[PDB]
């Protein structure tokens, strides 16, 4: 359930981290999914190909554009495939930060939250800005909107949200369309305030949501903006005052203080956001309230600790040499989606070392040794 208020504003490039992997462990003749997970990049424009034997795979899908707390984007490109002995797979990524496309080969051998993410990217001459909105309950996407898609409707991405009737979808479609129209205005407004040319492409990002404890009672709320991956204005934890990053955001801050925008946001974050998060947790209890403990194992190099098929994504993998936390000389890979609702992770640093796994689905933390 989105916010029914779109206040207008008044008034650094990051290269993608790439991971290529399969959904399940590879077994010849067994149908699987080949994933390429790009993350931590800015701006959002990116070209991702899945390669099979030095050739592009035709039918490749990808997740809806979302971003992290630091405003950097992440995407999951995937396709169904049956691996065999001869076939070799890789992922090729092109981005403004790269002098040439990077290829990465596939090595065959509690609390709850609701979040809404909004991205609008200007395309001068090419048409109206590309607007993408996604909604999350914890680490599960359940709604989306894409301005270039055919439906021009808010679409379901989880089974438990398909229950909702036409009044729900009409309202969310109305609100998300007004979201995009406001960000379109914000793009043209921010271009002039920063004295930028009309030909360049720019990005505005909006994020808001609410956290609840295990008692489903309000904990914290968020409502922040970014321009070109840089903090612009954010609502503080008290939900009453604003943090402005630079002089352009000070004008927006004063306009929003005079219009009492924070009062309307606090009512949403403390009340409406919590109310519908509780409804979603109930309607999708089979999916949202499950815990899946990580299937763990270890491998030795000629030491890598693995964790697979766990939910939620929150996990901790630490290395200990004789009990002391060995932070240095430790390669920790970012948690990645398997594509079926579960997640994966591994860390790398013989009998003196141990791997510690902490996860909500585990009765007690696990220790792994060679």
């Amino acid at each position: 359930y989105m916010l029914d208020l779109q206040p207008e504003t008044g008034c650094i490039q990051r290269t993608p981290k790439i991971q290529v992997y399969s959904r399940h462990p590879a077994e010849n003749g067994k149908s699987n999914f080949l994933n390429c997970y790009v993350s931590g990049f800015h701006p959002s424009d990116i070209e991702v190909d899945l390669l099979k034997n030095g050739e592009r795979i035709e039918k490749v899908e990808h997740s809806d554009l979302s971003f992290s707390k630091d405003w950097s984007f992440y995407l999951l490109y995937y396709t169904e495939f049956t691996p065999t002995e001869k076939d070799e797979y890789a992922c090729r990524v092109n981005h403004v930060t790269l002098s040439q496309p990077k290829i990465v080969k596939w090595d065959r051998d509690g609390s709850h939250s609701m979040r809404y993410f909004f991205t609008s990217v200007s395309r001068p001459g090419r048409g109206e800005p590309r607007f993408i909105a996604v909604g999350y309950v914890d680490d599960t996407q359940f709604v989306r909107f894409d301005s270039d898609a055919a439906s021009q409707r808010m679409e379901p991405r989880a089974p438990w949200i398909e229950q909702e009737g036409p009044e729900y979808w009409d309202g969310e479609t109305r609100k998300v369309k007004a979201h995009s129209q406001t960000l379109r205005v914000d793009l043209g407004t921010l271009r002039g305030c920063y004295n930028q040319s009309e030909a360049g492409s720019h990005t505005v990002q909006r994020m808001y949501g609410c956290d609840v404890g295990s008692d489903w009672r309000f904990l914290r709320g968020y409502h922040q903006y970014a321009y070109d991956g840089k903090d612009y204005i954010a609502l503080k934890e008290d939900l009453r005052s604003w943090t402005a990053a630079d002089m352009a955001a000070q004008t927006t801050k004063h306009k929003w203080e005079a219009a009492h925008v924070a009062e309307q946001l606090r009512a949403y974050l403390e009340g409406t956001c919590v109310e519908w998060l509780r409804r979603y947790l109930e309607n999708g209890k089979e999916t949202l309230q499950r815990t899946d403990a990580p299937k763990t194992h270890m491998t030795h190099h000629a030491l890598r600790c693995w964790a697979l098929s766990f939910y939620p994504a929150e996990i901790t993998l630490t290395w200990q040499r004789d009990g002391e936390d060995q932070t240095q000389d430790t390669e920790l890979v970012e948690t990645r989606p398997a594509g079926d609702g579960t997640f994966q992770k591994w860390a790398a640093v013989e009998q003196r070392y141990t791997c510690h796994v902490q996860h909500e689905g585990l009765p007690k933390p696990l220790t792994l040794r060679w």
Partner: nanobody
Amino acid sequence: EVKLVESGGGLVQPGGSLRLSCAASGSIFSINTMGWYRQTPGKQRDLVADISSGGSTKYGDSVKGRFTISRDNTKNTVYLQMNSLKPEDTAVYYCYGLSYSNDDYWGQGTQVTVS
């Protein structure tokens, strides 16, 4: 191991045409997809056109309809027919190839300038 020999660039008038050519050395079983990227004004190089050994093609949006890639798959040589050239097509066009193990090879590039 693999060497890519490029030719066919140079100066051309607006509306004119050029035919780039790229021949791969070594075994025929050493290269699958062959094609071209071109240097953007900044750091990046953008996809122009490439073709698999089976003849599967892909074009960048800014050259669709005007550029045509073809392949004489006896010699692992690909040809890029660049029609209706504009000043915005001016760049260094890098030939590239993919091995059947997804190793990428890159040529030195050929400057293309449209008056």
